[PDB]
């Protein structure tokens, strides 16, 4: 969020306006809660990918069906690896406080990648929704709100 304000005041010839300094000071204050939320999502990664695959393959069985992409153990392992990647990028966005280092690695060219891989993007969005539900069950209320923030950004991005 510091790079955001820096390039924001850098396109202008002005310095960083002190309201931006206030938002940087407030983010610096909230960084400890951000780090605890990121570590709580970090250590419980196995559980979240399991429950996300659970809720997704209960929701959409066509990836399980042989016409779909995630058919067989190798393809379903690649599917859960994709969900692991998106959980990792969500933890990066939780620490960074703003969605730039997660959009730069997971969002900015995802539609043409998944189009030329054959997979539907709506099933990936449902998988990140299942990750958001499982992390909402894993965390407290003020933590699940702030995690569902960036999970919500990914779900809106994949659609």
């Amino acid at each position: 969020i510091v790079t955001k304000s820096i390039v924001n005041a850098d396109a202008e010839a002005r310095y960083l306006s002190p309201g931006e300094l206030d938002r940087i000071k407030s983010f610096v204050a909230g960084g400890q809660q951000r780090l605890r939320i990121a570590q709580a999502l970090t250590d419980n990664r196995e559980r979240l990918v399991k429950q996300a695959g659970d809720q997704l393959f209960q929701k959409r069985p066509d990836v399980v069906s042989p016409g779909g992409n995630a058919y067989g153990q190798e393809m379903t392992a690649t599917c859960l690896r994709d969900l692991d990647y998106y959980l990792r990028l969500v933890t990066y966005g939780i620490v960074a406080g703003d969605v730039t280092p997660i959009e730069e690695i997971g969002v900015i060219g995802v539609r043409e990648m998944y189009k030329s891989l054959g997979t539907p993007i709506e099933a990936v969005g449902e998988g990140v929704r299942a990750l958001k539900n499982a992390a909402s069950t894993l965390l407290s209320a003020e933590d699940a709100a702030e995690a569902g923030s960036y999970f919500d950004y990914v779900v809106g991005a994949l659609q």
Binding site: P61, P66, G72
Partner: protein
């Protein structure tokens, strides 16, 4: 082993080695009245026994549709017939449990080594207990019937029947 309501209250009474108390005989006296109701009730399950299994198989496979799609373990035709034979064996021993009145004959056949074969074969064990619950939803719907039977309170008996399915789903999942 095969035990009963009548024989299990003997078997613990043998282990303590005392004569049967009068309040145990008043307990067993309650059972005799209950038995007539049960026979009428258990006859309804066995007469609709084949109608339950396919109507559970209209949902056991429709809810998890990869199972009969190519790749699933219910795909080919003897694999599909394999499931039906086993599905009724749940009903074959649950009806033995309601007849005996105690689940000690249920736990030697459906609950003993069933969770071991179901990881040796490769079948989903949890995909059984989604549909044994669908049997229980249809079994207690038939047993609790207002037609052709003089109304008698069967709620006390019904609770025992519902549970046997929950024991049948717990040791598979």
């Amino acid at each position: 082993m095969t035990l009963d309501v009548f024989t299990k209250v003997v078997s613990q009474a043998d282990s303590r080695g005392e004569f049967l108390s009068n309040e145990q005989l008043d307990a067993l006296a309650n059972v005799v009245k209950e038995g007539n109701k049960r026979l009428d009730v258990v006859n309804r399950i066995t007469s609709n026994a084949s109608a339950i299994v396919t109507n559970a198989a209209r949902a056991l496979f429709e809810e998890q549709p990869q199972l009969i799609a190519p790749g699933g373990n219910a795909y080919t035709n003897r694999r599909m017939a394999a499931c039906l034979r086993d599905m009724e064996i749940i009903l074959r021993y649950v009806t033995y449990a309601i007849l005996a009145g105690d689940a000690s004959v249920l736990d030697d056949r459906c609950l003993n080594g069933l969770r071991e074969t179901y990881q040796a074969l490769g079948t989903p064990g949890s995909s059984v207990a989604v549909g044994v619950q669908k049997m229980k939803d249809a079994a207690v719907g038939i047993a609790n019937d207002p037609n052709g039977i003089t109304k008698g309170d069967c709620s006390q008996l019904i609770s025992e029947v519902a549970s046997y399915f929950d024991r049948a789903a717990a040791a598979v999942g």
